[PDB]
Swiss-Prot record:
Gene name for this UniProt entry: LGB
Keywords for this protein: Allergen, Disulfide bond, Milk protein, Retinol-binding, Secreted, Signal, Transport
Function: Primary component of whey, it binds retinol and is probably involved in the transport of that molecule.
This protein's record includes keyword RNA-binding: no
Description of post-translational modifications: Alternate disulfide bonds occur in equal amounts in all variants examined.
Compartments it resides in: Secreted
Subunit structure: Under physiological conditions beta-lactoglobulin exists as an equilibrium mixture of monomeric and dimeric forms. Interaction with LMBR1L which mediates the endocytosis of LGB has been observed in PubMed:17991420, but not in PubMed:23964685.
Pfam families, per database record: Lipocalin
A GO term from the CC aspect: extracellular region
GO molecular function: identical protein binding; long-chain fatty acid binding; retinol binding
The protein's name in its UniProt record: Beta-lactoglobulin
Source species of the chain: Bos taurus (Bovine)
Family: Belongs to the calycin superfamily. Lipocalin family.
Length: 162
C-alpha cells in the first residue's frame, strides 16, 4: 500500500470513452525512460463492463513498432481499486476524476517490498490542461517519483505519442 489517495464515490461507468495520457510519472527512471519501457503505455479508451470490470485499450511500443493492446482490470471490493491479471498482482487505483476532463490513476507492484509505481494524468482532449497537471503534481508530491514525462498536443494525436 504506497498510494493512499483514492476517489471517493467513483462511478466507474462514467469513465467510459476516449482518453489521452497527457503526463506520466514513475518511481524508477527505467520504468518510463526508453520508448519500449515496460510501463510506457498510452491510454486510448476505457470500456467499463456491466459487472463493473474495466477493459483498457492502449498503445505500447514493442519490437520497433507501436502495438495496440487490450487489458482487463478486474474490480475489487473497493470501487476505486482494480487488479490486472499478470504474473505478479498489479493494482490500479483511481486517485481522482471529474469524468468530463481529467482522471488521475496509479498502478503499483503489490510486493517488492519497496515496489514500483507509475501514475498518469489522463484527459479527454488533446490539449494541455494545466489545472489537471497541477492536480497530478500535487497528488504525486508525497510519492517517491524519479521520472516525469508530459506530451504536447501534436504528440497526443500520434500513435505512441511520436
Ligand atoms: C482508470 C484507468 C486505468 C488505466 C490503467 C492502465 C494499465 C496498464 C497496464 C500495463 C500493462 C503492460 C503491457 O501490456 O505489457
Amino acid at each position: 500500500l504506497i498510494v493512499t489517495q483514492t476517489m471517493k464515490g467513483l462511478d466507474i461507468q462514467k469513465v467510459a470513452g476516449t482518453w489521452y495520457s497527457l503526463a506520466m510519472a514513475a518511481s524508477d527512471i527505467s520504468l518510463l525512460d526508453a520508448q519500449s519501457a515496460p510501463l510506457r503505455v498510452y491510454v486510448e479508451e476505457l470500456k467499463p463492463t456491466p459487472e463493473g470490470d474495466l477493459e483498457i485499450l492502449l498503445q505500447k511500443w514493442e519490437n520497433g513498432e507501436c502495438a495496440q493492446k487490450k487489458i482487463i482490470a478486474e474490480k475489487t471490493k473497493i470501487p476505486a481499486v482494480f487488479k490486472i491479471d499478470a504474473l505478479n498482482e498489479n493494482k490500479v487505483l483511481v486517485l481522482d476524476t471529474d469524468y468530463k476532463k481529467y482522471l488521475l490513476f496509479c498502478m503499483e507492484n503489490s510486493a517488492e517490498p519497496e515496489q514500483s509505481l507509475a501514475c498518469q494524468c489522463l484527459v479527454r482532449t488533446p490539449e494541455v490542461d494545466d489545472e489537471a497537471l497541477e492536480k497530478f503534481d500535487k497528488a504525486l508530491k508525497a510519492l517517491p517519483m524519479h521520472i516525469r514525462l508530459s506530451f504536447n498536443p501534436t504528440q497526443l494525436e500520434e500513435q505512441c505519442h511520436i
